[PDB]
Amino acid sequence: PQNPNSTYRKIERPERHFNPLRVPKNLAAELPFKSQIVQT
Amino acid sequence: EAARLDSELKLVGEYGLRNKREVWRVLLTLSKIRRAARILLTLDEKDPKRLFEGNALIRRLVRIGVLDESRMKLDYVLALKAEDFLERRLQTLVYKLGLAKSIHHARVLIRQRHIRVGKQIVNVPSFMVRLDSQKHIDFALTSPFGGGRPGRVRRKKAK
Amino acid sequence: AAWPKAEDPALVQELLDCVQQASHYRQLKKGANETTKSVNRGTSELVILAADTQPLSIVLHIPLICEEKNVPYVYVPSKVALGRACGVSRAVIAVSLTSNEASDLNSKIRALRDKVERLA
Amino acid sequence: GAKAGKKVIVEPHRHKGVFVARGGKEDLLCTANLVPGESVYGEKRISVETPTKTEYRIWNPFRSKLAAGILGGLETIYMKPGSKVLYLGAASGTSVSHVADIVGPTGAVYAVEFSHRSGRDLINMATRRTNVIPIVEDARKPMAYRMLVPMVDVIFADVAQPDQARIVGINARLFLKQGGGLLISIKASCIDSTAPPEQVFASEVQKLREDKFFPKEQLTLEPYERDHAMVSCVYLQKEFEG
Amino acid sequence: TLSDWYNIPRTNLTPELKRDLQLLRMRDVVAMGKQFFKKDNRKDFVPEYCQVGTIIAGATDGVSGRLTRKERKRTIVEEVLSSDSVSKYKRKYHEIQEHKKSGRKGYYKKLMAARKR
Amino acid sequence: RVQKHRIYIVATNDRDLKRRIRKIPGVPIMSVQKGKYAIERLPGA
Amino acid sequence: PNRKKEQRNPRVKKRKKYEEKQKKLRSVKAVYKGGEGPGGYQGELSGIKTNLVKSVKL
Amino acid sequence: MPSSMFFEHNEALVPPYNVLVDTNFLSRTVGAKLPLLESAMDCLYASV
Amino acid sequence: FGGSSHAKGIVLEKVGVEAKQPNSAIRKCVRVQLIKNGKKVTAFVPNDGCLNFVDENDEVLLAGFGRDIPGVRFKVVKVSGVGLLALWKEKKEK
Amino acid sequence: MSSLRHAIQRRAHKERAQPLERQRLGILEKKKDYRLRARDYKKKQAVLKSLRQKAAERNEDEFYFGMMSRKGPGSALTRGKGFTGTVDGDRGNKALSVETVRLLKTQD
RNA sequence: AACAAUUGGAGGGCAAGUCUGGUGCCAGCAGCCGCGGUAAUUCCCUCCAAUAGCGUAUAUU
C-alpha cells in the first residue's frame, strides 16, 4: 500500500548562479557620462 | 572559576586520574601536612616540640619519599605541591618505571591484577608507595607478564 | 687535564648513584660515542667522564662540545666504578644523562649540576 | 628538507646584516660569509654571484642563542655592520663567527673565553677572520684585558655562571658605552635549579636593573630551547645609541 | 643595492624569478596539507632586494642530505614539477573545476534541452 | 609589573584595582576580610 | 538524552579532554618538543616572518 | 604568551610566594590589627 | 510561602488551554487551590506536554522558582504523587 | 526549555523532491532557491532603478574632459548594427609606425 | 546492534506542517502533528559542569 512519489529522497541542488546585469541599449546610451557603461 | 579547572585538568592529565575527587583528596592531605608544618613553624627553634615533632614529620616525609632526602628543613616541607604526592602514587610509578606504555595503561595494569608490590598484589592505583618499597614494583606471578598461564585470548587462540 | 675533578667525599658517590638511577629510568647514554651523540644533538642534561682512562685524550674531545652546548661535565676517577654504576659489565669511559619534562630524576639532575656548577 | 643544491632565494631580514633565505618547502636564517669559501664548523651555506663572490653561511638556532632570539622575534639586536661587540663566553667561536659576519670587515668582535681548548679553536677561527680578536682570559677579571678592549657598543652575554649579572655588571662598568647594548642569554636551570624559570628570569632582570641597566624586552627561546630567556637591555639610558 | 646589508642587489625581475616568488607566497598549497607555513599576506610579494642562491654542503650530511645530478634543477618551480603529488594537484584541481561547473551554464543548457526535447 | 612578569600575588582591597587585575589571567588577589586574609585565584590552599 | 561512548567512562572523557587542550596550547604558545631531531636542522620549517616581534616589552 | 601558563593557570607561582603590597592593604591591615607576614603566611600556609 | 518549601494543591482550572502559542506562559500556567492556606495561586507547568499530564481535581505538589507572565511564582513538581518530570519522561505511570 | 525538549522534538523534517514526471522540469524551489532568485532580482531592479534615475535626471549640457579622449555610445544610426548602449574601451593595440614594424619583421 | 552512566545546563540546524503580526518575497513565537506509509521508515547535533552521583524548592549563613 505505497506510493513512489511519497517517499523521501535525496535532493541534488547545484549552486545557483544568475545571469549578469543586463542594461538596455537606450538606457545605457542615455545615461550620463560619470555612469556610462564601458564595455570593450 | 577557571584557574581551578585548568589546574585540576592539568593534574588529571599529567597523572592519569578518573575524576577531580582524587585531586581534592590529595590537596586535602597536603593541606593537613602543610598545616602541621605551619603551626610547627609558629614556635622558635629550640622549642623541643618543634625540634622533635618537626624532626619526626620530615623523617616521615623523607621515608615516604615525598620530600627529597637532601633538603632537611620545615620551610622546604612547607614548599610542597600535589604533583609530589601524585608523583609518589603507584600508577605513576608503574608508568615512570616503564612497566606500562601509558598512564591509563598503568591504571588498567593495576585494577587488572597484573602487578605486585613486594608480597602483596595491589588492586588500588592510589597506593602511596613508600620510597623504600619503590624498587620492588613488578608484575604478578600468575599474570601472563610474570610467567604463568597466558590468559584468555591466547587460550581461545590455542583452542 | 681533569680540572673539573670530582671529590671522593660523596660527590663522586652521588654522581654514580644518579648514574645508576638514570640507568633504571633509561635516561642514560653510555660510552664516549653515544655521549658525544647526545651532546651534539643537545639532549644531554649532564655528563660525567672517567679520569682513569689509560689515554685520556680519547675522552678529552667532549669538554669542547659540552662547552659549546653549555652542559656541565665532571670527571669521576674510575671507569670501572662508572661501568658498574651503569650496569654494563664493561668499563664505561664517559656517560651522559638526559632528562624529560617531569621527573624526580630531573630534579636530581638539577641539584647535581648545581653542585657541578659549584665546582666549575 | 634543505638539501644541498636546492634553489633558494635570499632576501634581507629586518635586522642589519641578517639575511633570510626562502626556499620551496622551508626557510633558513643566514648571514653573509666574511671569509668566502670556508665553513667554520661544517655548516650549510649559500653561494650566488651578482647579476664566485656572494656567500651566506646558514645560521642555526639550535647551535646559537642569538639565532634563537632572531627567530624568537627580537625587536633589536643592537649589532649592525660597523658595531663593536663584546662577546662573553665564546666557546669555539661559532656564534662569534656569525656576529663577526654581522658586524663585517669594519666592525670588531672582542671574543672572551676562559677555556684553553675553545681558546685554540677560537684562535683558528679568529686567525681566519680579521675583525674578531681572541681573548682567552677570565670574564670575572676584566682588568686582565682592560689593555685589550675599548668602549664597545654591544655586549653579548652567554656564560653558564651563577654570578652572570655580576660578571656582565663589571664588564659593562669597564667596557660598555653610555647607553650601551646588552643581550643576555639566561639559563634558569643554571642560575637556580630549584626555582620556577619565570621567577629566575625576573630575578635576573631585577639584578641587571639594580645593576643600572634598563630592560627593553624579554623573550623566552622556547620552540628552540627549554627554560632559556633572552633579555635585551640598554646600559644607563632608556634609548640605545644616545 | 643596500649599503648596510652588504650589497644585495635590487631584484632583476625576470618571469622565471617572478614564478618563483609566486611559488614562495604559495608554498602552503605546494605541501598539500603536510606542512603549513607562516601566513604572509602582503599585497606585493616581489621584494625590493633578492638574490637567487643554492645550498652548497654540510660537512656532516653527504649521503642523504644532497641532491643528485637528476635533481639539481634550474628553478624552484621545476623542482616542484619534478617532485611527486603532481597528479594530486590535478586531482584537487578537478574537484574544484567539477564544483565550479556546478549549475553555471552547461547545467541550464541541459535544462533547456530537457524541456525542449 | 604584574603584566610584565605575572609571578606576584597582589595584596589589594579596592574594587578599582581588584577589578583591573581580574582582567589579566593567572594572578592571585589577596584581600583582608576583617579577621583574616583572602586569596582569589590561587588554586592551592 | 542520547549520550556519548566517551561520556560513558569519565576517565576516558578527561583523557580525550586533556589531549585536546594539550593540542590547543600548541596553537597558542611555543612548546619545546625536542631540539634538532635525527636529520639535524633542515631549516626553519613552517616559514620565517620578518616583521613580527613576539616578545614582552620589559 | 608568558611562560608557565596553561589556560589561565600560572604554574610559575609556587612557594615562597611573592606578594606586591599596596597602600590600601597596608592601611587596612594596620587597621585590622592583623600582622602582615604571619597572616599572609597563615592564609597561604607557605613562606612568603 | 516561606514557612514550608513545597505545598500541596488541587488543580482547579487549566488556565488557557485555548491559547495559540504552544510553549507560551499563558498555556503553561495552571490555577491551583492551596490546601492548607485556602488561597488560589497559579503555577507554571514547565511544558505543554506536561500540561497534558496535569489533569483536573488531582493532588499536585508545587514549589517555588529562583531567578510572558513575570509574576506567576510557583511551579508544578508532582501530579498524584509521581513527579511531573518523571511523567514527562517515560519513567513512571500514575 | 532546551533541556525541556525531547530528542524526537529535535528531528529534522525532510524536504520533499518532485514527482518523477516533473523531474524533467527541474528543482522544486522551496524557500532557499526562491530567496536566491528574489534577492538577485531585487538587486538587478535596484540597479536599473538607479540608472533610470540617472538617465532621467541627467544634464544635457554637461562637459567632462574625458569626452575629448573617449568615444561615446552613439546611437542606432551612428553605430548601426554594431550598436550596444555602451562605450568601447581600449585593448592597448595601436597603429604601429613603419620603422618599428621593420624591426619586428627582421625579427620574424 | 553491547555485559547497554547518570544528573543538570547552554546552543545550532529542519517541512508542500501550524499559529500570529504587516503599507508583496519580512518578522515573530514555535514545530513528536507533513502527501502516502507502521514490517512504514533508516534519517542530525555541538559545547560546558559534576561524575556512581546529581538536580530542585524554602530557611538561609
Automatic annotation (TrEMBL), chain B:
The keyword Chloroplast does not apply. One of its GO terms (cellular component) is cytosolic small ribosomal subunit. GO terms for molecular function: rRNA binding; structural constituent of ribosome. Keywords: Ribonucleoprotein, Ribosomal protein, RNA-binding, rRNA-binding. Residues 1-87 form the Small ribosomal subunit protein uS4 N-terminal domain. The keyword Cell membrane does not apply. Residues 88-159 form the RNA-binding S4 domain. GO terms for biological process: ribosomal small subunit biogenesis; translation. Belongs to the universal ribosomal protein uS4 family. This is 40S ribosomal protein s9-like protein. It comes from Chaetomium thermophilum (strain DSM 1495 / CBS 144.50 / IMI 039719).
TrEMBL record, chain D:
Keywords: Methyltransferase, Nucleus, Ribonucleoprotein, RNA-binding, rRNA processing, S-adenosyl-L-methionine, Transferase. The chain holds residues 64 to 313 of 313 of the full protein. One of its GO terms (biological process) is box C/D sno(s)RNA 3'-end processing. It catalyses: L-glutaminyl-[histone H2A] + S-adenosyl-L-methionine = N(5)-methyl-L-glutaminyl-[histone H2A] + S-adenosyl-L-homocysteine + H(+). It comes from Chaetomium thermophilum (strain DSM 1495 / CBS 144.50 / IMI 039719). GO terms for cellular component: box C/D methylation guide snoRNP complex; small-subunit processome. Its main location: nucleus. GO terms for molecular function: histone H2AQ104 methyltransferase activity; RNA binding; rRNA methyltransferase activity. It comes from the Eukaryota. This is rRNA 2'-O-methyltransferase fibrillarin.
Automatic annotation (TrEMBL), chain G:
Residues 1-25 are annotated as: Disordered. It is found in: Nucleus. Belongs to the SAS10 family. Residues 1-58 form the Sas10 C-terminal domain. This is Sas10 C-terminal domain-containing protein.
TrEMBL record, chain H:
It is found in: Nucleus, Nucleolus. Belongs to the UTP23/FCF1 family. FCF1 subfamily. This is PIN domain-containing protein.
